[PDB]
Amino acid sequence: VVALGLDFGASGARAIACDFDSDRSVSVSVTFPKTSQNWPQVWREALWQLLTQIPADWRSRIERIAIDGTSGTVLLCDREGQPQTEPLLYNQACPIDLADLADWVPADHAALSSTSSLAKLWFWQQQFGALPPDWQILAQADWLSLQLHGCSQQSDYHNALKLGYSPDRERFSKNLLDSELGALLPVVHEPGVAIGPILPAIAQEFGLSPDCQICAGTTDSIAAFLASGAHQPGEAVTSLGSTIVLKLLSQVAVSDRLTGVYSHKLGGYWLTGGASNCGGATLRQFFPDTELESLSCQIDPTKKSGLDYYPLPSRGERFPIADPDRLPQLEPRPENPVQFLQGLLEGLTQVETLGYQRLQDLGATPLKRIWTAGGGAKNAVWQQLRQQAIGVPIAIAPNTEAAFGTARLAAFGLAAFHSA
């Protein structure tokens, strides 16, 4: 089976066509601008650009397609899926009262956030005054897949979560559906399942098989986890990037609105996680990468530095423990740059350690092993510190590209996420 993964991220889009019986693939890219008067046009043209750059052989052989997008990026469209106003991007917050959403979702549901799809739909509602029932709100991944299969008001329970969906009960609340916003809500499927065949005109134009299936997509954050291949509960993917992002697979859904912790449904399992303000950005504040490496070579993890740092890049922390007033803790600062670096890596290690423990304290399945992604994943000293402090096998994630995880999503769905 040959599947195509389309990933639309923060500043670009990547396509990965993958042949899974050959384990061979091709990857193409499109880079977004940093400003547009028409982001829908930018995204749609990116879609055709990605498809075009794929060789004719692969395109003829593609049987399934899936698309992941940025979580919280939504479009207000009419009956035909035509943008009626500018998209509200993932980073944009809305000046609405979250108390106006209380009757549509449970106590501290993930949708209760000024940046959620639901909050943006309510913002649009109070903007236009009254939204027509034949209109629809679409996530980025939704709208793009709509360009492929032509079926309107279709989404997945990953993107739809922050729209107010409850994947624990597999439904929107009856009060939300009965509401004035109800007619704009999409039909929610499981990521990976076939929505419908590709549009005949689209298939013919781009030399794709007319029998190719367009699946239900995901978020790019979840696609990244799917790229690792981890499917057993207790397994976790750690992203050692600018910020440390933890993703833990569990048999139980856990949530903590205080620390921004919530859970996505993933087949029969649950994907929980948390994001710290700490990360490699703190490291770059004192070292360039080259110097960072030359100094890491001289660090022996088997001996404590005596330093107890909390490596925030600035004031404020959100996970594992929430404290907006917490300041970075980088004292005492030794004269030896090597040992100061060790203190930093030890602090970042503690963040990850306390992060996974916090997740387990909330009820998540105990950590079995860790797959690592991001820039710090290649840092073996950092890996040793993480390993000896956490106590589980830690390795580098085989694949990390979101488009590849989405290609796997197209090829196999979420089938691996069940009891064997």
UniProtKB/Swiss-Prot annotation:
- Annotated substrate binding lies at 7, 11-14, 71, 220
The residues listed in the UniProt record as binding ATP, with positions renumbered to this chain, are: 242, 280, 375-379
Q: What is its EC number?
A: 2.7.1.47
Q: What does this protein do?
A: Exhibits ATP hydrolysis without substrate. Phosphorylates D-ribulose.
Please, one GO biological process term?
Answer: xylulose metabolic process
Question: Out of the domains of life, which is the source?
Answer: Bacteria
Q: Which UniProt keywords apply?
A: ATP-binding, Kinase, Nucleotide-binding, Transferase
**GO CC terms on record?**
cytosol
Report the protein name in the record. D-ribulose kinase
Cofactor(s) needed, names only, are: a divalent metal cation
Keyword Amino-acid biosynthesis in the entry? The reply is no
What results from changing residue 220 to A? Answer: Reduced ATP hydrolysis in the presence of D-ribulose
Q: Which reaction does it catalyse?
A: D-ribulose + ATP = D-ribulose 5-phosphate + ADP + H(+)
Similarity comment: family membership = Belongs to the FGGY kinase family.
An MF annotation (GO) of this entry: D-ribulokinase activity
Is ATP-binding included in the keywords of this UniProt record?
Answer: yes
